[PDB]
């Protein structure tokens, strides 16, 4: 069981990207993923989350509206739509598998970089 | 009574994002048990109510998450 | 904002010196209760964090069972029976009977 993420980088306050995390080693159909975050030498936070089939999505508060999450189970892929990007932002991004309440499965982390 | 929506075959629960009041899981929940159940979300799994006293909820037997 | 609190999760001590061999005991306390939905995390440096606990006591597949939790409601403790020397590490507590679910600051575990 392994998940893989990519597409982070260098950005500008306002900017946008796409994250994108893949699976493997499991029935991707089955298990509700999710995004989350870490500010270097801080602590951890939840940034959203999509379940079976797409049924239910949320975000945290300091993101709604500004990103958009989303699956393909085709593809065995989550993805993380960034826009209108802030110095917040900037952090070490997870991908993760839905424990049913934890997240039992972390991928490696891609880093977000938001200046000014 | 109420109980958890259970995955018969793989014997999982079934994670919800909108704690509390959700639609996916009254969607899910009267889809198993009848469209007379309700249910919304609790601890990030669909909770079921309304369910006949027989209605088989979580856990099923050696059928592991 | 949307205006709502937060579960605030405090950890302690912030920093814990023991040696191998030695018990280690971390502690979570939420401001209301959680009753059992408390996860535990590991985090190494550089790494990213693992599932300890997916509930107060329910141990991840593959953690050993020299890690013990136990507690209910707003106190809740982990034990580490015989320190290993790779059990140095961060621990990270994590609340999921509310929304948005939140963490501790954790629990830096240090050698003595």
Redesign the interface.
């Given at each position: 069981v392994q998940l893989v993420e990519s597409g982070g980088g260098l950005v500008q306050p306002g900017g946008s990207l796409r994250l994108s995390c893949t699976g493997s080693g499991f029935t991707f159909d089955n298990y509700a993923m999710h995004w989350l975050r870490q500010v270097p030498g801080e602590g951890l936070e939840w940034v959203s989350g999509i379940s079976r089939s797409s049924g239910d999505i949320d975000y945290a508060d300091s993101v709604k509206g500004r990103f958009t999450i989303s699956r393909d189970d085709a593809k065995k892929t989550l993805s993380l739509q960034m826009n209108s990007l802030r110095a917040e932002d900037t952090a070490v991004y997870y991908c993760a598998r839905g424990g049913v309440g934890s997240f039992d499965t972390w991928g490696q982390g891609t880093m977000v970089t938001v200046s000014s | 009574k109420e109980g958890y929506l259970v995955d018969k075959n793989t014997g999982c629960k079934y994670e919800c994002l909108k704690l509390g009041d959700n639609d996916y899981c009254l969607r899910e929940c009267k889809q198993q048990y009848g469209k007379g159940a309700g249910g919304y979300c609790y601890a990030f799994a669909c909770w079921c109510t309304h369910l006949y006293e027989q209605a088989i909820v979580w856990p099923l037997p050696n059928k592991r998450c | 904002?949307?205006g709502g609190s937060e579960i605030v999760l405090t950890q302690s001590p912030a920093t814990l010196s023991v040696s191998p061999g030695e018990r280690a005991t971390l502690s979570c306390r939420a401001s209301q209760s959680v009753?059992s939905?408390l996860?535990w995390?590991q985090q190494k440096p550089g790494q990213?964090?693992?599932?300890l606990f997916?509930?107060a006591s329910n141990r991840?597949?593959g953690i050993p069972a020299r890690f013990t939790g136990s507690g209910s409601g707003t106190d809740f403790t982990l034990t580490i029976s015989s320190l290993e020397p790779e059990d140095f590490a961060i621990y990270?507590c994590?609340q999921?009977?509310?929304?948005?679910?939140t963490?501790?600051?954790?629990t830096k575990v240090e050698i003595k």
């Amino acid at each position: 069981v392994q998940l893989v993420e990519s597409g982070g980088g260098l950005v500008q306050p306002g900017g946008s990207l796409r994250l994108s995390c893949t699976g493997s080693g499991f029935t991707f159909d089955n298990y509700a993923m999710h995004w989350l975050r870490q500010v270097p030498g801080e602590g951890l936070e939840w940034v959203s989350g999509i379940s079976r089939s797409s049924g239910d999505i949320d975000y945290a508060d300091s993101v709604k509206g500004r990103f958009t999450i989303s699956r393909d189970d085709a593809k065995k892929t989550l993805s993380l739509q960034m826009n209108s990007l802030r110095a917040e932002d900037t952090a070490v991004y997870y991908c993760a598998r839905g424990g049913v309440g934890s997240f039992d499965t972390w991928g490696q982390g891609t880093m977000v970089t938001v200046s000014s | 009574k109420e109980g958890y929506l259970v995955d018969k075959n793989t014997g999982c629960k079934y994670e919800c994002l909108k704690l509390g009041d959700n639609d996916y899981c009254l969607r899910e929940c009267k889809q198993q048990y009848g469209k007379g159940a309700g249910g919304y979300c609790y601890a990030f799994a669909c909770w079921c109510t309304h369910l006949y006293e027989q209605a088989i909820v979580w856990p099923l037997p050696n059928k592991r998450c | 904002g949307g205006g709502g609190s937060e579960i605030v999760l405090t950890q302690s001590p912030a920093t814990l010196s023991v040696s191998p061999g030695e018990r280690a005991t971390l502690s979570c306390r939420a401001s209301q209760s959680v009753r059992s939905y408390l996860a535990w995390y590991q985090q190494k440096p550089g790494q990213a964090p693992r599932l300890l606990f997916s509930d107060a006591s329910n141990r991840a597949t593959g953690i050993p069972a020299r890690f013990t939790g136990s507690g209910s409601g707003t106190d809740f403790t982990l034990t580490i029976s015989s320190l290993e020397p790779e059990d140095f590490a961060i621990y990270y507590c994590q609340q999921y009977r509310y929304s948005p679910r939140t963490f501790g600051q954790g629990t830096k575990v240090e050698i003595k």
